[model samples]
Target chain A: MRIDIVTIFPACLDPLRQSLPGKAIESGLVDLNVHDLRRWTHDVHHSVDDAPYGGGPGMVMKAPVWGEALDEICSSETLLIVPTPAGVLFTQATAQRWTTESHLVFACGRYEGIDQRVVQDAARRMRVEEVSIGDYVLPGGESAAVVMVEAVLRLLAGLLEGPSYTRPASWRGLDVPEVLLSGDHARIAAWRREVSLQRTRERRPDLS
Target chain B: MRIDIVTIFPACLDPLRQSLPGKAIESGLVDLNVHDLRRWTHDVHHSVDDAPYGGGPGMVMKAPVWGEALDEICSSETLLIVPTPAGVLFTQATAQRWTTESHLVFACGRYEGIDQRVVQDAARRMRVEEVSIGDYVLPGGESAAVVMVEAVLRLLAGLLEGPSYTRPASWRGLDVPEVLLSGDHARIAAWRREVSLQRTRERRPDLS
Candidate 1:
């Protein structure tokens, strides 16, 4: 799979260059590209944000650079991922869904968020998935991009041979329940699903 | 504020040193520490994971190292933030709450997650705030630490004082809503609250 990220701070993508995801890229299972959004900026400062036409507290990410970056990075088959607090909440199920895609493109917006024109135009070109990692605001979308990449990459067929044994059965002393450890595959699957449901229901009932 | 993170791969923490959050560290507004969990390992291979007594598919992070790491890094007043999908979804309100604390110690778990005993022991030494960035599962919690740090640091007073124009306001064809742009501070405050409520309601009714 090929993943391209457009951001003003390319160094922000460095963390992905280490650990398991880094190893995945090195092994040729995935292609990771981090493009500097400023490269498409035409101005003297290469600025990407400006004051809202209407008075407001924070600047909105400019539309032009985002548009240019999206145009250059997108393809007919690519899946576009935009990181924003207001976007759809990212989930493990979402990661499973993204695994089938051939290519992924992420826009890392700073300030409030990217201009609507850029987001809408990009959507017209590819399947755009607006994702908010959580309800909190981030300094930028770089971290969210990391979250997206890691989640999607892990679900790829070759990424994990056999069943995934690393997923948490329980957290904070909570048990994975006795049904999951039973030898029956069908029962295990049912238990796992219910565990996921119960956990999300209790912790993030909104997602439930 | 001082922030210490315990993880197997210290390099995974590199992203925090390069972006807006990096500026927070450079300016001495926050002290960021990333410790290798293996440093606390006692075995020849510097092992930090072990099989669960009841038997499980994946290795569980050992409790010894997690306990040792916390003992060394945490202070009486530190807020311990553990990133797990099972925890409460992180929110802007949570970030606001954390900014007031003097320190944050994060435990980034991998495999099936750290041993329950270790997490419990660590809790005895500091105020524990178990947080999940979103519902997705990744290879580890290092990325979530970067997300949490960025979220918490940006909300600090004087962190981004100038025009402070980057605060959330509706744009990109999405109106900031007439109530916020209204001149009355009380009404604007009420409007902002309503926007937040409306936003949380529509995007994450579960959070509501």
Candidate 2:
């Protein structure tokens, strides 16, 4: 799998090179690239944000730079993920779904979020997903991008050893349910499906 | 604000030092510290995880070291934030609440999260919040901690100057309704309240 992240602060992506995700990159299961969005800017200042044309409190990340960056980085085979507080809430199930794609690209927007035109334009050529890690707003989308990469990368086959390697459904005595531990293959599969739904319902009923 | 994070891999906290959140630290509005949980361990191996007495697939973060780390870093005035997928969903309102805290301590647990006894013990001394950035599970809680710090720090009163500030209720051209941009303060405020309620209802109805 290949993951490309476009952000104004490329240094923010450095942490990925030092941890479990870094191991995934080293083992050749994933190729992670962080591109500086400013590289696409034509102006001397290389600014990425500007006042909204209709007037707003915070600046909107400019569309032109994102347009150029996406055009250069994305292809028909890529899945583009846009991070924002207002976007659809992301989930482990979503990450599992995304693993089927050959390439993933993330556009990390700041300020009032990347100009709407950039997202609209990117949707024309590639599969686009606007995702929010949660309901809260952050200073930028780099953290969100990191969250997505880690979640998706871990779901890839052989990233971790052993069947017990799957994160147990629950921990700290929260209980993974008896059926899962029962070792009855069919029942365990049914229990997992049921638990996934039950957990999602309890934790994120909105997604249902 | 003073923030101390307990994690196995301190380098995972590097993302917090690179962007706008880094600026907040550089300006002295926030003090960020990363401590390896292993520092509290006594064994030769510096072990921080152990098998549950009842038996489990993954290792559970040990309670004793976590308790020691919490006692050493947190004070009577500190707010403790625990990042986990099963915890309460974090939101803008939560960030607003955290800004009032003088200090914030984060316990970034891995494998199967921290021992319940450890978190329960810490809660007795100070405000302990179990927070989840989203539904996805990552390798550890460091990314969620970074997300929380950035979200909470940006809302501090003096961080950003002038009219470029983002108020939680402002109308961004996303899921927010068109009614909020009507210009009348009363109407805008009412619309914002309604929109927030509607949004939380639609996206997180379980919380509602």
Candidate 3:
């Protein structure tokens, strides 16, 4: 799989080379390219954000720069995703679908977000998804890109499962369940499922 | 606000220095620190993970390293948050609450997860909460911390309100809304609200 991330803060994404996402790239599972959003800017200052269309407080990422960037990076096979507060929620299931694509083009919007026209135009040719990682908002889409990338890669790892515990068996009065110690593989699996379900129910009932 | 992020990958957080979260710290609004979890490991190998108790596909982050790290960094005033798939969703409201905290200790669990006993033990001393940013599972909590920190700090950036656009009033067949060009502040504000509502309705009905 290939991913092209166009963000104004390209330096910030360096950590991707040192983590699991990095391992994925090194192992030949992922082909990743990080680009500066300003590379498409043709002006003297190389500014990418400007006043909003109807006028407001902060700047909006320009549509024209994004247009040129998308044209160079995005292809008919690209799955273009824009991270924004005003988009559908991102989920593990969303990551599942993204794994099906050959290439992913991420537009990391900053300020008030990209000119709507940029997103509108990107949709005219390829798959475009505006995803909100959560209800909260961030300064830019770089973190969101890191997030969606990690989530997708972990699923591809196939071993993305279960909680871990270390032994001394008992720690501060809490004990690893006896079923796990019994070494009955079937029983341990059952106990794992039960506790996993209980934790999910007590915590993430939304997923339950 | 002081935030201490305990992660196996400390360098991955470089982007925090370039974004709003970094600005908040540079302006004296936040005291931020990132620590390597390996620093707490006493062994020569400095390993932070081990095999799971009941036999699982992946390793679980060891509890001992976490206990040592938390012991050194977390205190009664620490609002300890661990990002996990099984935790409650993170939102703008969650970030809001975090800003009120004097010290925030983020445990970025890798592998399958940290030993539940580590979190269970932390709760016995300091305030501990597990959180999930969106529905996907990332390899570590570093990105989640970045997201939460940015979300919270942006709110602290005074005059936080509405969208912003820039010049080149018309570009490649697209034109800025006329209400903005009319030089009527009230009309521009009203138009901004109307367009914001319409876009949110069309793109994020769930938010509406």
Pick the winner on TM-score between candidates 2 and 3.
3
| Candidate 1: tens digits of C-alpha lDDT, residues B3-50 | 888888788888888867788899999888888888888879998886
**Candidate 3 local lDDT, B115-166, one digit each (tens):** 9899889999899998888767788888888777778778775511233445
- Candidate 1 lDDT tens digits, A1-208: 8989888888888877887788888999889999988899888998888875335567888766677778787887988888877777787888998888889888888877776556666666578877778777788889889888888877772411111222245544545445545667777666556766776766666667
For each candidate, the alpha-carbon lDDT, in order, equals 0.74, 0.75, 0.81
Q: Estimate each model's TM-score.
A: 0.80, 0.78, 0.91
Which is better, 1 or 3, measured by DockQ?
A: 3
Point out the worst 10-residue segment of candidate 3 chain B by lDDT: B157-166
DockQ, model 1, C-alpha based: 0.32
lDDT (C-alpha) at residue A55 in model 2 = 47
Comparison by lDDT, 1 against 2, better one: 2
Q: How far off is residue A100 in model 1, in Å?
A: 0.8
Q: Pick the candidate with the highest DockQ.
A: 3
DockQ of each: 0.32, 0.27, 0.57
lDDT of 3 by residue, A1-208 (tens): 9989999888777767878888888999889899998888999999998766554567788878989999999988889998877777788789998888899888988877888677767888898998878787688889888888888887765512345577768987988767778878999887778877877777766556
> Higher-DockQ candidate among 1 and 2?
1
Record all residue pairs in model 3 with backbone atoms less than 3 Å apart, i.e. clashing: A50-B165, A50-B166, A51-B165, A51-B166, A52-B164, A52-B165, A52-B166, A58-B164
Per residue, candidate 2 scores C-alpha lDDT tens digits across A31-131 of 88999988888888988887754244678777656777888889988888988765667988898998898999999987777765566567777888877
Docking class of 3: medium
